[PDB]
Structure 1
Amino acid sequence: AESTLGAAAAQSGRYFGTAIASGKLGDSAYTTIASREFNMVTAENEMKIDATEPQRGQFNFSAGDRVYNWAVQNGKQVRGHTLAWHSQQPGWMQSLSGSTLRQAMIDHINGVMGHYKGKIAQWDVVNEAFSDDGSGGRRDSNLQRTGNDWIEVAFRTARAADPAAKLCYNDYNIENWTWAKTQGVYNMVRDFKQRGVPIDCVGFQSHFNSGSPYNSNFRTTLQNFAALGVDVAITELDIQGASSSTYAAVTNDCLAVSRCLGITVWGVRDTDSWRSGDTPLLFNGDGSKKAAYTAVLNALNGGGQIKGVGSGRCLDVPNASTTDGTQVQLYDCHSATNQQWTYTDAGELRVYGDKCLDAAGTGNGTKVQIYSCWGGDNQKWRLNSDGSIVGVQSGLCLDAVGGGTANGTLIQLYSCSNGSNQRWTRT
């Protein structure tokens, strides 16, 4: 299929997943989207060390199993997250070191993987072991202090516990090839593969924002790692601002690499995000598809003026008016500024640089006009591959009033119908 992210990824043998919080499994708006769009699930916190072994030797899999069962029952594979980590260790584990800690780490791995043996597709065996200090060296943690070979030991232990699972090393800020951290990790995987240490994949968290932005050399990093013989996976993707171009770029980078298994966005709706303030996901709080959703789906499915298919006329701001509240119309196409629209990464259709195509409401018959740009959802649009233009807030289509084709025919929001007065062609 090609209507949902998971189905469209499946076409090239990949998956499109999300992080699931068991706390939201009761929320129907949440499960409706999650069940429909994704085919891979990562438990947000449920499979962490603190959650699965609250007390030494005493394993708890209630929350983890809840997420796991939901996933399998809804046709999704699962990524285990995570076995050894310097962060979120239960207090009992923080009170350990040396041989005792090393042993605890091993017991925890066997305990968790044993419970889930044969039913987890990929495991993030070791998470965030490298430093951010620009050294490209490991981070000083109680685990690292037990011995530099702990990472190798963890992977060897993991392989033994469940040989059916793909074992990955997971980390953030290893996306830009030029970074000292990316090099540090690369060198470790290189070494591991040379010495036969069991590592099947490298997960790239992909938490992009203005502090650590996406760079096109990400495709290069993915290709260099894949050239070592490991699979690569985009594991916790979210982009500050949810730029349509950046989401499409990351998606195409995965598609360009045969060893890229798939992509997992870190959450369902912006409000579910650990960084909701950055509106970094594909669905907004209302559960509606953002402009980025369409950019991602179109990328997975394969690879100026706005002219009405039914009329052969262009979207025009009457007499080149700049006043807010001016309703747009159809008019003979001509090379004028009032007929030139720019679709931004935020999902706006700008004219005159700072005026936005705006919906004055959410119902059928709603007037489509220009108004100062401010980032409201009523000024965000989705340009579908079928030629329809859907408002993000309303979910309705741009519609030439009454099917009119003459100059002066007005534009409104209306139930999408695949009609020609709802079909547009960017030129």
Structure 2
Amino acid sequence: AESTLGAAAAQSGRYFGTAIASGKLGDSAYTTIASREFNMVTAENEMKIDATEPQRGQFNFSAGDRVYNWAVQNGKQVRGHTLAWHSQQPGWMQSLSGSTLRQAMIDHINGVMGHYKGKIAQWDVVSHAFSDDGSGGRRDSNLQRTGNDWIEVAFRTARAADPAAKLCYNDYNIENWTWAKTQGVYNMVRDFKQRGVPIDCVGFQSHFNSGSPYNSNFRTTLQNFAALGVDVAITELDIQGASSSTYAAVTNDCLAVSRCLGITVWGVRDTDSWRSGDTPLLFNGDGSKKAAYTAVLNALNGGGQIKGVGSGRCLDVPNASTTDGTQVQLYDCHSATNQQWTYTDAGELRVYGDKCLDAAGTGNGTKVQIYSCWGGDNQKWRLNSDGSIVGVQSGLCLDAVGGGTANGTLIQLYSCSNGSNQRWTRT
């Protein structure tokens, strides 16, 4: 299949997952999208230390099992997140140190992995162990103070607890190869593989924003780790602004690495995001697919003027007008600014530089025109591989009225039909 992210990824033996929040599983809109699009699930918080072991020796898997069962019942594998790390520790663990903390760490791993033995595809055994100070060294935490060998111990413990689970080291800001942090993790994993430490994968959270931007060398990082003999996975992907090109780029990086198991985005809709203000996911709050969604889908499926297939004519702004409200038409193709459209990372189709293909409504027959660019979803479009152009807000296709092919045929929104008057080719 190839109409959903999970199915499209499966074509190359990969998966496309999301982070599921137990509190949202009772949401029809949420579950409809989640069950349909993803085939891998990570509990957003339900399998962390404080959630699974509120009291030392007292385990609670109610919430974790709810997400797990929903995942398997709906055809998704599960990534366990996370067994040992400095964040979100229950109060009792936060105050522990030395040998007692080391024992608690081990006990926690055995308890949680034991409960889910043989049912977890990947476990983020250790997370966030390195610092952001630029030294490339370990971050100072109670776990690190128990001995630099805590990570190695965590992994050896995990292997014995559940030999069937792939064991991953997970962290953020380790995507750009030139960063010290990235190098620190690389050296650690290289050391582990050389000494036989049981580690099967490295998880790259991939939280990209202007503070820690995506860089094409992320592919190099993935390939360098893959060369060590470990699988790699994009575990908590979200991109500030949800740039279509960046989302497609990350997707293609995984597809370019045979050892990249799959990609998980950190959430379903922008409104479900831990950083909703960065509108970093693939679905809008109203549940509509964003421009980035189609960019990712096209990439998973194999991956100027806009000319209509059925008419052989180009999307044209009448008399090269720059007046807001001017409805677009079909017209003989020629070199003119009123026929030069630029698709942006935000999903707009710009003309004249600051004018945007705009839909003045959401129903059939809605006039497609130009209007000042401002970022509305009625100015954002999805470029399908089949040649159709779908409005984000409306979910409707650009359509040449009445199947018209002559000069002057107007453009409207209309239920997608795969008709030639709804298919376009970029020149």
Does the alignment reach a TM-score above 0.5?
A: yes
- Which residue number in structure 2 is paired with residue 119 of structure 1? 119
Q: How does 1:344-355 map to 2 (within 5 A)?
A: 344-355=344-355
Partner SS state of residue 168, structure 2: strand
Structure 2 residue runs without a partner (length 5+): none
Whether the 8 Å contact between 2:234 and 2:263 is mirrored in structure 1 is yes
- The CA deviation at 1:311 is 1.1
- 2:274 & 2:364 partners in 1: Cα distance? 35
Report how far residue 308 of structure 1 moved: 1.0
Q: Distance between the aligned counterparts of 1:191 and 1:64, measured in 2?
A: 33
Q: 8 Å contact 2:303–2:385 — kept in the other structure?
A: no
Runs of 4+ in 1 over 4 A off after TM superposition: none
How far apart are residue 303 of structure 1 and its match? 4.4
Contact 1:399–1:411 (CA under 8 A) maintained in structure 2: yes
Question: In the TM superposition, what whole-angstrom CA distance separates every residue of 1:83-113 from its partner, at most 9, and x where no partner exists?
Answer: 0010110001112111110011011000000
| TM-score normalised per structure 2 | 0.99
What is the rounded CA distance, in whole Å, between the counterparts of 1:320 and 1:94 in structure 2? Answer: 66
Could you tell me how far apart the structure 2 residues matched to 1:212 and 1:238 are?
12
Q: 2:180 & 2:418 partners in 1: Cα distance?
A: 51
Is the Cα contact below 8 Å between 1:400 and 1:421 reproduced in 2?
A: yes
- Residue by residue, what CA displacement relative to the aligned partner does 1:114-147 show, whole Å, maximum 9, x if unpaired? 0000000000000000000000000000000111
Contact 1:170 1:205 in 2 (8 A): yes
Q: Which residue of 2 aligns with 1:195?
A: 195
Partner of 1:19: 19
Deviation at 1:285, TM superposition (A): 0.6
Q: TM-score, normalised by structure 1?
A: 0.99
State the SS of the aligned residue for 2:212: coil
Residue aligned with 2:274, SS: coil
Of 234-243 and 302-311, the range deviating more from structure 2: 302-311
* Alpha-carbon contact 2:317-2:339 (below 8 Å) kept: yes
Q: Is the 8 A contact 1:348 1:380 kept in 2?
A: yes
Q: In the aligned structure 2, how far is the partner of 1:163 from the partner of 1:2?
A: 33
- Report the RMSD for the aligned CA atoms in angstroms: 0.6
SS of equivalent residue, structure 1 residue 154: helix
- CA contact 1:219–1:254 (8 Å) conserved in 2: yes
Q: Is the 8 A contact 1:252 1:303 kept in 2?
A: no
Distance 2:178 2:308 in 1: 46
TM-aligned CA deviation for residue 425 of structure 1: 1.2
Name the CA distance, whole Å, in 2 between partners of 1:163 and 1:70.
Answer: 24
CA-to-partner distance for each residue in 1:389-416, whole Å, 9 max, x for gaps? 1100000111111111111111111111
Cα 1:415–1:303, aligned 2, differ >3 Å: closer, same or farther? closer
After superposition, the C-alpha distances for 1:266-294 in whole angstroms (9 at most, x for unaligned) are 00011111111111111111111111111
Maintained 8 Å contact 2:331/2:408: yes
Consecutive unaligned residues of structure 1, counting only runs of 5 or more, are none
1:249 Cα deviation from its structure 2 partner: 0.7
Partner of 2:57: 57
Match of 1:100 in 2: 100
* Partner-residue secondary structure (3-state), 1:110: helix
State the distance in 1 between where 2:267 and 2:176 align. 23
Report the CA distance shift for 1:124/1:344 in structure 2 as closer, same or farther (over 3 A): same
Q: Deviations over 1:372-392 (max 9, x none)?
A: 000000000011111111100
